[PDB]
Amino acid sequence: AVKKFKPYTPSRRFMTVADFSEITKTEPEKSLVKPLKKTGGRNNQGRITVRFRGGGHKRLYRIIDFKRWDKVGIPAKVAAIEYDPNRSARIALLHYVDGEKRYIIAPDGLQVGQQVVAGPDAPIQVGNALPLRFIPVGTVVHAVELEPKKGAKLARAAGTSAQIQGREGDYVILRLPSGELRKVHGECYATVGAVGNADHKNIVLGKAGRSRWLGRRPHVRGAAMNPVDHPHGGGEGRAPRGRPPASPWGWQTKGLKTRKRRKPSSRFIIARRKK
Amino acid sequence: MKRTWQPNRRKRAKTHGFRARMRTPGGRKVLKRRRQKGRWRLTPAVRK
RNA sequence: UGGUUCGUGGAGCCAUGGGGGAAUCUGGGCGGACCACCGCCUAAGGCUAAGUACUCCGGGUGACCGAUAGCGCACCAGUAC
RNA sequence: GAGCUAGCCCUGGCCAGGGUGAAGCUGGGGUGAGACCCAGUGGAGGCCCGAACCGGUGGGGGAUGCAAACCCCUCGGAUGA
RNA sequence: GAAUGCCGGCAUGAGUAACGAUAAAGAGGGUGAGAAUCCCUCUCGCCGUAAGCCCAAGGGUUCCUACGCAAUGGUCGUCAGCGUAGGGUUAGGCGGGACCUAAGGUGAAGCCGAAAGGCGUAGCCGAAGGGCAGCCGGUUAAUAUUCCGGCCCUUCCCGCAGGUGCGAUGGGGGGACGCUCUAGGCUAGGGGGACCGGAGCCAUGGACGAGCCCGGCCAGAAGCGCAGGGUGGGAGGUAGGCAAAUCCGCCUCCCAACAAGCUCUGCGUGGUGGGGAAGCCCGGGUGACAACCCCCCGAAGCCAGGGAGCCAAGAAAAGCCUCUAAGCACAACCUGCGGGAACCCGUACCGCAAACCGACACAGGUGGGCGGGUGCAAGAGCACUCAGGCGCGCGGGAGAACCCUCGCCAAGGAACUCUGCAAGUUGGCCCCGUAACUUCGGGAGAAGGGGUGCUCCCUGGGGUGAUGAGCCCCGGGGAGCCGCAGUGAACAGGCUCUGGCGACUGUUUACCAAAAACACAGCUCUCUGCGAACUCGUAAGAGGAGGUAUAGGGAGCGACGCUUGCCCGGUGCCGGAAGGUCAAGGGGAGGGGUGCAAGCCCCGAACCGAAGCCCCGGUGAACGGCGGCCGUAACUAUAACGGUCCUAAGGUAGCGAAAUUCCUUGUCGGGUAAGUUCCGACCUGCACGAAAAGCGUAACGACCGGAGCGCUGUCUCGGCGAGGGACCCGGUGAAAUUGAACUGGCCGUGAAGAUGCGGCCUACCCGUGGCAGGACGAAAAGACCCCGUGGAGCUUUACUGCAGCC
RNA sequence: CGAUGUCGGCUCGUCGCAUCCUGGGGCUGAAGAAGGUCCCAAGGGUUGGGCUGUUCGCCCAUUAAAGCGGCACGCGAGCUG
RNA sequence: UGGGAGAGGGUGGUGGAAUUCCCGGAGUAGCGGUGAAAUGCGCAGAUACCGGGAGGAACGCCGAUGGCGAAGGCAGCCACCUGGUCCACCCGUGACGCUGAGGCGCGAAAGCGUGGGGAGCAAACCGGAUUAGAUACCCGGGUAGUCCACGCCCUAAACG
RNA sequence: CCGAGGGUAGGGCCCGUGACUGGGGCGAAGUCGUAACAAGGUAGCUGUACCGGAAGGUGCGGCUGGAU
Numbered sequence A: 001a002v003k004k005f006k007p008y009t010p011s012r013r014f015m016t017v018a019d020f021s022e023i024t025k026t027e028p029e030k031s032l033v034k035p036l037k038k039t040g041g042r043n044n045q046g047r048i049t050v051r052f053r054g055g056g057h058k059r060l061y062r063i064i065d066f067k068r069w070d071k072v073g074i075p076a077k078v079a080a081i082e083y084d085p086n087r088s089a090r091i092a093l094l095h096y097v098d099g100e101k102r103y104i105i106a107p108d109g110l111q112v113g114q115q116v117v118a119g120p121d122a123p124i125q126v127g128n129a130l131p132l133r134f135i136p137v138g139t140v141v142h143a144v145e146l147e148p149k150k151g152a153k154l155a156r157a158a159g160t161s162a163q164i165q166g167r168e169g170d171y172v173i174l175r176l177p178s179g180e181l182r183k184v185h186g187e188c189y190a191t192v193g194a195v196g197n198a199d200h201k202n203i204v205l206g207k208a209g210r211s212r213w214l215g216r217r218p219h220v221r222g223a224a225m226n227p228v229d230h231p232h233g234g235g236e237g238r239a240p241r242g243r244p245p246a247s248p249w250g251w252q253t254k255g256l257k258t259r260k261r262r263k264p265s266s267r268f269i270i271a272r273r274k275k
Numbered sequence B: 001m002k003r004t005w006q007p008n009r010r011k012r013a014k015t016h017g018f019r020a021r022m023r024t025p026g027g028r029k030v031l032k033r034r035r036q037k038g039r040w041r042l043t044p045a046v047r048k
Numbered sequence C: 001u002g003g004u005u006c007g008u009g010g011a012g013c014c015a016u017g018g019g020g021g022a023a024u025c026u027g028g029g030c031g032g033a034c035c036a037c038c039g040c041c042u043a044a045g046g047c048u049a050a051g052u053a054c055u056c057c058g059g060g061u062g063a064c065c066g067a068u069a070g071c072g073c074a075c076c077a078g079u080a081c
Numbered sequence D: 001g002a003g004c005u006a007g008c009c010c011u012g013g014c015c016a017g018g019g020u021g022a023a024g025c026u027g028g029g030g031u032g033a034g035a036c037c038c039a040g041u042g043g044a045g046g047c048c049c050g051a052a053c054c055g056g057u058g059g060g061g062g063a064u065g066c067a068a069a070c071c072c073c074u075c076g077g078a079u080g081a
Numbered sequence E: 001g002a003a004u005g006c007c008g009g010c011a012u013g014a015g016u017a018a019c020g021a022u023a024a025a026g027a028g029g030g031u032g033a034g035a036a037u038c039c040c041u042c043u044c045g046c047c048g049u050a051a052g053c054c055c056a057a058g059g060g061u062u063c064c065u066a067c068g069c070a071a072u073g074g075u076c077g078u079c080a081g082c083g084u085a086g087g088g089u090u091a092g093g094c095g096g097g098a099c100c101u102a103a104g105g106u107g108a109a110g111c112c113g114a115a116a117g118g119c120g121u122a123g124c125c126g127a128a129g130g131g132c133a134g135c136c137g138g139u140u141a142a143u144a145u146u147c148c149g150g151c152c153c154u155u156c157c158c159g160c161a162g163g164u165g166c167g168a169u170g171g172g173g174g175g176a177c178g179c180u181c182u183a184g185g186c187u188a189g190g191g192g193g194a195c196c197g198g199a200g201c202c203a204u205g206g207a208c209g210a211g212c213c214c215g216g217c218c219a220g221a222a223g224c225g226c227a228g229g230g231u232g233g234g235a236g237g238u239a240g241g242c243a244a245a246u247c248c249g250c251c252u253c254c255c256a257a258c259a260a261g262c263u264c265u266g267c268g269u270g271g272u273g274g275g276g277a278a279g280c281c282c283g284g285g286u287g288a289c290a291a292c293c294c295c296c297c298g299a300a301g302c303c304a305g306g307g308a309g310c311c312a313a314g315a316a317a318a319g320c321c322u323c324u325a326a327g328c329a330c331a332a333c334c335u336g337c338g339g340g341a342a343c344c345c346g347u348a349c350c351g352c353a354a355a356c357c358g359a360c361a362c363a364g365g366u367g368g369g370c371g372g373g374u375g376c377a378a379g380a381g382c383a384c385u386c387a388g389g390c391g392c393g394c395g396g397g398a399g400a401a402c403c404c405u406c407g408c409c410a411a412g413g414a415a416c417u418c419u420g421c422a423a424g425u426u427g428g429c430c431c432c433g434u435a436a437c438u439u440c441g442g443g444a445g446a447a448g449g450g451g452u453g454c455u456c457c458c459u460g461g462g463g464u465g466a467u468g469a470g471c472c473c474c475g476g477g478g479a480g481c482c483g484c485a486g487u488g489a490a491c492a493g494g495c496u497c498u499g500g501c502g503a504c505u506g507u508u509u510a511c512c513a514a515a516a517a518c519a520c521a522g523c524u525c526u527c528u529g530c531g532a533a534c535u536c537g538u539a540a541g542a543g544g545a546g547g548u549a550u551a552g553g554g555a556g557c558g559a560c561g562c563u564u565g566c567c568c569g570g571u572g573c574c575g576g577a578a579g580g581u582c583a584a585g586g587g588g589a590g591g592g593g594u595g596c597a598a599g600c601c602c603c604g605a606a607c608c609g610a611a612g613c614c615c616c617g618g619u620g621a622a623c624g625g626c627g628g629c630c631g632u633a634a635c636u637a638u639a640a641c642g643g644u645c646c647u648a649a650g651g652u653a654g655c656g657a658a659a660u661u662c663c664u665u666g667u668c669g670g671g672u673a674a675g676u677u678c679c680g681a682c683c684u685g686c687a688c689g690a691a692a693a694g695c696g697u698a699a700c701g702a703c704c705g706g707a708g709c710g711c712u713g714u715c716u717c718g719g720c721g722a723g724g725g726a727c728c729c730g731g732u733g734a735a736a737u738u739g740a741a742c743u744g745g746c747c748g749u750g751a752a753g754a755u756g757c758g759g760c761c762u763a764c765c766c767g768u769g770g771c772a773g774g775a776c777g778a779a780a781a782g783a784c785c786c787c788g789u790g791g792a793g794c795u796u797u798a799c800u801g802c803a804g805c806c
Numbered sequence F: 001c002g003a004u005g006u007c008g009g010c011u012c013g014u015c016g017c018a019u020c021c022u023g024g025g026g027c028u029g030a031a032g033a034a035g036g037u038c039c040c041a042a043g044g045g046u047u048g049g050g051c052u053g054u055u056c057g058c059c060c061a062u063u064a065a066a067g068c069g070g071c072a073c074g075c076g077a078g079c080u081g
Numbered sequence G: 001u002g003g004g005a006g007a008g009g010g011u012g013g014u015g016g017a018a019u020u021c022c023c024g025g026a027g028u029a030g031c032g033g034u035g036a037a038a039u040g041c042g043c044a045g046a047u048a049c050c051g052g053g054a055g056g057a058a059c060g061c062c063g064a065u066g067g068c069g070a071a072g073g074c075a076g077c078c079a080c081c082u083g084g085u086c087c088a089c090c091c092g093u094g095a096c097g098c099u100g101a102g103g104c105g106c107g108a109a110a111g112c113g114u115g116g117g118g119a120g121c122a123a124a125c126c127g128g129a130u131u132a133g134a135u136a137c138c139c140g141g142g143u144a145g146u147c148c149a150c151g152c153c154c155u156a157a158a159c160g
Numbered sequence H: 001c002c003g004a005g006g007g008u009a010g011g012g013c014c015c016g017u018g019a020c021u022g023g024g025g026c027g028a029a030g031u032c033g034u035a036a037c038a039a040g041g042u043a044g045c046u047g048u049a050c051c052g053g054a055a056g057g058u059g060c061g062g063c064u065g066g067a068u
């Protein structure tokens, strides 16, 4: 449930914050954090290559286990569920009976105290990871590897999930969170369940300052600029676009598809996204 | 008001210093020229 | 594509980024598309004095200057600033 | 050339005093249970007033200046983008 | 002889402006050739969250002393941050290095690029972050945590003794972290004392007093005490912590658990060592054998790595502890003691400024710490004042105009003016009281009003004590006293009504614009399946993101409410294995050059041959667009209705003389005595209209209109007063500008606006204070305008090309 | 065009006279009072306010009257802006 | 205390028929639609036929002049949770009752907010017809909505 | 002290009036259509919603107070 505020300042009138209800441990695991090196949107040449970044809260990176096939057959206890600033999902602390500790992204319904496992024989239950080929068609699934042993790449965002639709040869067919229909190899791991924190999308930032805390610096309209700067720049008074709406670099930005044409994975995409 | 010169010894050595000039083709050519010109100081005087 | 006087021209020659791809003198390249004839020359390895260029340096000489000239500097100047 | 200025990055520092009184929590009431109401407690906020500090609203002065942008009065922000 | 030429010299303006904050001076004494300006004394004023003190930058001898005054100093100079010389900076414990790492930089491996070079996990460098051992006092002209004195401490080497499986760059723990709020106990600092110590004082009407005035501490090992911080112990199992591990992790069991224990720090005490006032004598002596005590206030500092709450979720690495590995176990390491050893650089002085950044001894700019007392509710605000520091490096007179800054003003009260611009008014605190509207927070300090000093008497609660006294905090009730006046000085909102725009706090054109502009939460379209799209880069490599469609890019719109209509013919984008066109290349009917020939060489039709384009469809919060004429209704007027041309379709809701309305001050209504503005309406909207969004909207605004009350020198309409200038005398002494000048008025004339020409008129020679009509006054080779086959920024369905993409 | 600052206002005037008022006069379709119309006359006078940047103009309240023009559409080294 | 019938209510699962779209196959000149047509779709291969898949919605036969509920209403099947009601026994309580201004709850559909979901249907809207005209009826399209969760709205020929 | 009332300021309720505007009643000698009454020529009515010169239409659900 998202948390509202009474309108005791102009901004609190709309601000909503997450409830943090699932959260049970308020400090990360010391040996599982490392500093996040903040970039500001600058590459190694020092140049802004992604605009409007910088200035957010300091963050420690929590190391996440996006492999999991790494420790087949060894079970673990879900020790805690925690906040992670580097992602929308919460993360779950796993105590393996081995004694190793790792983090995973926390699926909807993971209970602290429960046990999870990975491998071809794992029970089809929330929290477990198996190759896709051993997961019943119809099951909703998250953190999916896109190619075997390359790490979880799909459905990691708060609330997201993928569903297994069918099988074909060495591949299963997934419905991605976008609704794309795609073949993913049978040997790729996925974890049963959807990602938690599904209310994430209902948060209302509420004020300029909150975007600022997120490291998101103000974004300025091409329309508010000059011709040296942008296709929409200039004109006396306000102006309509005056040409097909364009990015600062001139490419058209309402409809122009941009996926590379001859791309090898086209062969594995069955149906481009919906809506 | 605050003007443009705000001396900083470290800044001065790290920017115009002999080692900085030597690191780069442009700086080495600055030294080539200033030697050819007969400059008494090839590099800004700075105290350390 | 460049080089040549040659700017696509009738455009050869020399060179070569791409593709194809030989032969050993009865071999090959050239004489301005091409062909014949008649000649010239030996590619795909390397070196080679001298005669040539310059003047930081030394000397000699001016129908060259003579301290606003002549070098930016005749003087502690690439200095003071 | 970023010792000015602009943005970002790493690491530190600063923000008198006063006011308002969110959520929560406790208690009382209420009900089938509730919602909810009251009190106390609490101490939220690009909240309020106002120094430092950061500004530069209106006016006057200055105008071969004290100053190649200053001075006086006034005024904006002042836990936050 | 001219180039607003170039370099230099010297004039003019001119003994003119100015001499750099309006904090301020006066006198006596000294010194010296010379004194407002240097020294000393007394008096006066100014700063005192500083204009005092300590650090860091930067500066670089400016420090101290002697001897000097040409120049430097806005005057003077005997003085000085100036000239000459001589002296002066002392560290194992402060800071940095021989320690750690951050961003970043560099960079074995490796990757990339015509060259130069660009990258790059490790490593290395890199600090104002981590880590690490010194406090108090004394001494010099000038250094002192550095020398001295006292009491403490660190590492390294060697040794002795006791202990122990010792050993590391490898494993682990730890180091180790936010913001707001905050407890207990301390300390810093401060106030009081009838107590303690002290030179002395009794004035001028009174006082020999519980009088006045001054001071009443600092540092300190172990031990002890108080207050906090950190931390469970034992056993068994073990497959994880890229070897090993008894360590750490994980499971189980036993004992302990808001305790204790162990440990670390703060504070108190503590052997000892220091300091020690006023005043009085000449920095020093005395005071003094100084006293060195009690109470109160009390941190933002300390215990600390404390506590709670919150979301935006808050460095690393070494030191250090532990584990084991090669090894080694006569070693090694730990603990205690002893002896020896302990390097390099900085240290003067300025440091909110006359020594730093501003060309200047420049009213500007410059990070951190300390920053006393009283009173005003609080405070770092305000006034005064301590310590300490200053009177700002020209002065002396005078008492015009005018200017600046300031004070008052009869009657009036916005009549001023573009405008209440400016200045008044209001003003803190306590209490009463407070509207529309509202998103229920607010609007609100709405508005408006009362109180406010001192004296006496009665009385309530809290802190510290002890439960009491004293001290400190928060009050209540009663009776009075004085003045024009009690936040008696200083600091401290004028208010209301009503529209436009923008939701809001924010941001901006450094130096003419702070806004209605930008941003903003939020809404929508669109791209993107991840070696993402996208951006930078020739590339490698990076950003995106150690993210993954609840995400990332781009675009418009801009809280919120109610909404967002019709047109897809053109352009864009999307989709469309047909068809048309379509390059290289394929193909080779047919043809040609040459040769006696085989042959060599050239042209070449059909036909096959991509993207793109054409073509077919979709698509508007994609670019965009959203009509005209004729007729018709019981009088006129109009036209619900009919007809007709045109178009891709003809503007919906809502709004409308508007931030848009030309005609225009439209018309009507409101407000005013009067209203080109303002508000409300109407609708023939020159030329609104739905995300270049439409219409509204509480709250907000140094935004822009209109009105009212309050109050005023804004004004009728001006007067007086103050100080700083202006003026006069001494000192120092610019500037732009300047063809030369012996430089009047009129009417004419003249290249059309004459001191300079004609005619007349007027006029003795030369200044000083003032005014600005002229010298087409000065400044700036007009910025508007045009011209130049001049330049540059920007645009596109101009031309041509290139990157990029297909 | 190697610069002649440009509307309005304020301030300060000064001049013309085709006179707004005041003084003198002729004609009158001048009984009187009050007008009209022309002539002479420039000595002096010629108000305060609402609107608007306005000049102009309209309006309110008065007046003997509420004149029109010139002076670089007088006057920015005099101010405003 | 024994028993009973029932689409009474809530949750979670879950089955087959059909429609639509996509994929594969096979096939060709029309299909569709009306009173008749036209728009529309179709040689860029539609309709009709076979196989595969996706997704939402409603549950045919049983079915009734049936049943359940206070009403609004409720219908494939399964389980769990849960209300009402009837019967028999004549065992317990001992008038503990009726109605009920206010209040509280529930309340078809449409509609509204936030988020899902979207096959068929379908306001608005485009187009074809009909017609004197035809902002309609009929035809081809088509967005909200119809569906789910949660919160609102609180109407009705909410009727016997 | 209290005190008629006066003055200042802010509120509440009611009456009158107002550019302009919304519908309503009526009149009737008009224009436009023909929604309801018959199966009223699309059964009607209905709550709601969107829409149209106008009666009205359509969607969803409901009622019969529906002809055959």
Ligand SMILES: [Mg+2]
Pocket (backbone or CB within 6 Å): A003, A004, A005, A006, A012, A013, A014, A015, A016
């Ligand atoms: Mg809220």
Ligand SMILES: [Mg+2]
Pocket (backbone or CB within 6 Å): A004, A005, A006
């Ligand atoms: Mg709430």
Ligand SMILES: [Mg+2]
Pocket (backbone or CB within 6 Å): A007, A008, A009, A010, E441, E442
């Ligand atoms: Mg508010």
Ligand SMILES: [Mg+2]
Pocket (backbone or CB within 6 Å): A007, A009, A010, A011, A013
């Ligand atoms: Mg608000």
Ligand SMILES: [Mg+2]
Pocket (backbone or CB within 6 Å): A019, A020, A021, A022, A023, A090, A197
């Ligand atoms: Mg949670």
Ligand SMILES: [Mg+2]
Pocket (backbone or CB within 6 Å): A001, A019, A020, A021, A022, A197
């Ligand atoms: Mg949750």
Ligand SMILES: [Mg+2]
Pocket (backbone or CB within 6 Å): A027, A028, E314
């Ligand atoms: Mg943390």
Ligand SMILES: [Mg+2]
Pocket (backbone or CB within 6 Å): A031
């Ligand atoms: Mg670590």
Ligand SMILES: [Mg+2]
Pocket (backbone or CB within 6 Å): A034, A035, A036, A037, A061
């Ligand atoms: Mg990282």
Ligand SMILES: [Mg+2]
Pocket (backbone or CB within 6 Å): A044
């Ligand atoms: Mg780098």
Ligand SMILES: [Mg+2]
Pocket (backbone or CB within 6 Å): A049, A050, A051, A052
């Ligand atoms: Mg970008």
Ligand SMILES: [Mg+2]
Pocket (backbone or CB within 6 Å): A040, A041, A042, A048, A049, A050, A051, A052, A053, A054
């Ligand atoms: Mg950026």
Ligand SMILES: [Mg+2]
Pocket (backbone or CB within 6 Å): A082, A083, A084, A085, A087, A088, A089, A090, A091
């Ligand atoms: Mg999270």
Ligand SMILES: [Mg+2]
Pocket (backbone or CB within 6 Å): A018, A088, A197, A200, A203
């Ligand atoms: Mg969240």
Ligand SMILES: [Mg+2]
Pocket (backbone or CB within 6 Å): A201, A202, A203, A204, A205
């Ligand atoms: Mg949101």
Ligand SMILES: [Mg+2]
Pocket (backbone or CB within 6 Å): A056, A057, A058, A085, A213, A214, A215, E312
């Ligand atoms: Mg953040």
